[PDB]
Enzyme design. Structure first.
Site, PDB file in Angstrom:
ATOM      1  N   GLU A 209       1.267   3.729 -13.118  1.00 39.56           N
ATOM      2  CA  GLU A 209       1.099   4.526 -11.902  1.00 39.56           C
ATOM      3  C   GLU A 209       0.364   5.848 -12.149  1.00 39.56           C
ATOM      4  O   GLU A 209       0.334   6.705 -11.259  1.00 39.56           O
ATOM      5  CB  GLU A 209       2.451   4.820 -11.255  1.00 39.56           C
ATOM      6  CG  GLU A 209       3.184   3.563 -10.752  1.00 39.56           C
ATOM      7  CD  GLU A 209       4.530   3.861 -10.102  1.00 39.56           C
ATOM      8  OE1 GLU A 209       4.812   5.013  -9.713  1.00 39.56           O
ATOM      9  OE2 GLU A 209       5.321   2.916  -9.976  1.00 39.56           O
TER      10      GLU A 209
ATOM     11  N   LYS B 269       8.635   0.026   1.536  1.00 36.90           N
ATOM     12  CA  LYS B 269       7.655  -0.838   0.855  1.00 36.90           C
ATOM     13  C   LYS B 269       7.428  -2.063   1.723  1.00 36.90           C
ATOM     14  O   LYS B 269       8.292  -2.949   1.799  1.00 36.90           O
ATOM     15  CB  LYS B 269       8.153  -1.288  -0.520  1.00 36.90           C
ATOM     16  CG  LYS B 269       8.188  -0.201  -1.596  1.00 36.90           C
ATOM     17  CD  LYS B 269       9.086  -0.656  -2.750  1.00 36.90           C
ATOM     18  CE  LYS B 269       9.025   0.289  -3.973  1.00 36.90           C
ATOM     19  NZ  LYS B 269       9.853  -0.267  -5.090  1.00 36.90           N
TER      20      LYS B 269
END
Ligand SMILES: O=C(O)[C@@H](CO)OP(=O)(O)O
Ligand SMILES: O=C(O)[C@@H](CO)OP(=O)(O)O
Ligand SMILES: [Mg+2]
Ligand SMILES: [Mg+2]
Lengths: 437, 437
Positions: free
Chosen positions: B211, B345
């Site tokens: 990330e 999400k």
């Protein structure tokens, strides 16, 4: 007709600001994002950075953005240029700046407008971008040629903590039959290499560098290459995957000699190599490993050492720092028979027209052209359409990791699908992709 | 009118296949890409993988792609669906699959169609995507609210060597006055952190995790938090930068207890922590660091431990694996007073409509909503338009490095610019961004 030219600051894949340009025409709003470049240097086009230490570590691009908005934009819109005439667009920009190295307006300000114009042109013509680029470059379109991706797997040199002097280690799936198969098998070799790396060098060695490859603390070129060959074979692709190197040998060129232990402060200056000696080092590697391409084997001004090695190298030799996408330097390399492929960085010259010309001049001389990413990339996929439009047969756009790399690779998947039976994968013919069939 | 629905395999930011969907209408071709998590919550909607060892390490998505091309597509086109009615789009997809967890077609087959329909709808309506999403969710647009970015900067747990068990350390520039400023100042902290990490842990510890944050061999949470504070200070932004954690505690949850030495094969089982003891650990960190949010402090079904901690936590507590963006699980968490924010999400649940419902249920209970990326991301920018449409005031979409992260952050810059006076930056008011002004 171009009604609006606009620039803003956005972030590159390293988290530094870069220039994004939008051109508005009757067909809509067309966006190009400029990758990271160089704001100092002796030959290349210079991007403009703000140098305000209190903002973005001095790496702001506000001045370049202001040059687009305040200087380029009103004059460009007033000029009412035909975007389809890429040469006119670029002549306009080059003349407005008035400096060889594009340092008045900034190479980043200029390239943004250059590239956005080509996208607006493709839309006016109702063709995909790669087709328009084919038109501009007069490339053969029966068939089109999809490139072998030179995929980064492992880095040494300035980008790693071992003794290893060489900079980039790449895999090239020349033995695949389609681009889709090439990317699949390359990705499989990549994951196998990563898992082997973490097993042998520790979890942290699995963290990725700027372009998505690993950088464990490797000691020798042989260590790195054995690891790669072993990952190729473990993934089941021996014979279908070849290797490309970037030595970036300018990084270890000292007082006329080459220091293969340059990261060692106490490097034995008696172990340093001459031109012919370093060449033999490469010869030794070539005997033991499936190396099909070597970039920057000798330093950026060491012409005689390039010319010598090239006599017997017998594989593709790629010029990067030697040439810096600079027309005069490319001409020199061609005359001196120093290499036989150009690493092409669009932002290093600063317009699409000049980039196309550099590729054409290389092709004329029987050279190859490897279309290249930069360290600070973006979500822009221009170079994917460009490599196809130029019919080069080879692209270097990162590991199959980090989406500033995958965006290009995914775009190539899409292009291949679209072209179907009117495109072929370059495969083993990557070097002369432009003359294939 | 939808004339065509198509899917293909593309690569995510880790070099693993994922599903890309294109929907064609009179307004053009609309593309959406499905992200992918790692060590996903047991209760997430099914991500369908091929499991063919001989292709992509068993991680192919050919079966999910086929479900789009051969099953969803023919039916969807013949269903006469109004793409503007997202509820109808999703009702149709859900009725085809007929399973609670989308195990018939795969959530990664369903989601891409769900998302691409909303893009096609925005285009039919002549509105940007965020405005369409505001309409779909019945959110206020006078003004819109721009999110505080929770920037991943340092990773531990299974993401790193060293002993550190907590997974994720984020910075949140709440003290900024615009989104542009927040991203600038956050980027400066990130670069300072990179330099510090390289200085203290070696050049290779500068390399990044999935990330974009650094992932050096760190031993303790305090060592990591002290490093982050040092970086904030060196960047000059003390007082304007806050901290979020994602503990991802399910990863170290062992039969009722929490093993903070879980990477040690000989970890001392008598030292594993109870729910109350781990809560005390958090309280200690909270007193010494400007932590304003903690995500997954306890395991995905360890409800009692969530409830106990929430009584005195006094800062934002975010549910990720506990709630898996599922209104059924959200209702339970609300009832048990387990948390006060949802990590949203879209691919945990599989449709846009259910994701919007999850946000609305959360806001109605006085929760916050932090819209989130997955660790496997793509060049898709949907979640940037979504976080603005939903008016949440907070997004988690990576470090300011790797363009699968910057693509979202750059899109937010563009949205802020487009909106001008029509939008406000959430700042200190991130938790209740939906209720701002
Ligand atoms: O060395 C290079 O070829 C490029 C890409 O790796 O790096 P930079 O863009 O930093 O010059
Ligand atoms: O845990 C999370 O919140 C996400 C992003 O950080 O990770 P993953 O997508 O792997 O679930
Ligand atoms: Mg190079
Ligand atoms: Mg989480």
């Amino acid at each position: 007709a171009v009604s609006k030219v606009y620039a803003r600051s956005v972030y590159d894949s390293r988290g530094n600001p870069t220039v994004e340009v939008e051109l508005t025409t009757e067909k809509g709003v067309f966006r190009s994002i400029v990758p990271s470049g160089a704001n100092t240097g002796v030959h290349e086009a210079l991007e403009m950075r703000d140098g305000d230490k209190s903002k973005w570590m001095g790496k702001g691009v506000l001045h370049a953005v202001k040059n687009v908005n305040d200087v380029i934009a009103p004059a460009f819109v007033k000029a009412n240029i035909d975007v389809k005439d890429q040469k006119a667009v670029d002549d306009f920009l080059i003349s407005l700046d008035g400096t060889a190295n594009k340092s008045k307006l900034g190479a980043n300000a200029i390239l943004g407008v250059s590239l956005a114009a080509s996208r607006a042109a493709a839309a006016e013509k109702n063709v995909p971008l790669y087709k328009h680029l084919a038109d501009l470059s007069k490339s053969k379109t029966s068939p089109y040629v999809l490139p072998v991706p030179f995929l980064n797997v492992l880095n040494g040199g300035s980008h790693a903590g071992g003794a290893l002097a060489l900079q980039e280690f790449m895999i090239a799936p020349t033995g695949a039959k389609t681009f889709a198969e090439a990317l699949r098998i390359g990705s499989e070799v990549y994951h196998n290499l990563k898992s082997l790396t973490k097993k042998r060098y520790g979890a942290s060695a699995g963290n990725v560098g700027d372009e998505g490859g690993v950088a464990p603390n490797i000691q020798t070129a042989e260590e790195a290459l054995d690891l790669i060959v072993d990952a190729i074979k473990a993934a089941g692709h021996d014979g279908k995957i070849k290797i490309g190197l970037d030595c970036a040998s300018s990084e270890f060129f000292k007082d006329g000699k080459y220091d293969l232990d340059f990261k060692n402060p106490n490097s034995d200056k008696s172990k340093w190599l001459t031109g012919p000696q370093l060449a033999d080092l490469y010869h030794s590697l070539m005997k033991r490993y499936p190396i099909v391409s070597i970039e920057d084997p000798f330093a950026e001004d060491d012409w005689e050492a390039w010319s010598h090695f090239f006599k017997t190298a017998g594989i593709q030799i790629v010029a990067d720092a030697l040439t810096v996408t600079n027309p005069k330097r490319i001409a020199t390399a061609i005359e001196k028979k120093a290499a036989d492929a150009l690493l092409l960085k669009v932002n290093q010259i600063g317009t699409l027209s000049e980039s196309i010309k550099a590729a054409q001049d290389s092709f004329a001389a029987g050279w190859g052209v490897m279309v290249s990413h930069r360290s600070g990339e973006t979500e822009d996929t221009f170079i994917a359409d460009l490599v196809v439009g130029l019919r080069t047969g080879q692209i270097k756009t990162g590991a199959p990791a980090r989406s500033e790399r995958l965006a290009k690779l995914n775009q190539l998947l899409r292009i291949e699908e679209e072209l179907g039976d009117n495109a072929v994968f370059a495969g083993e013919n990557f070097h002369h992709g432009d003359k294939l069939l």
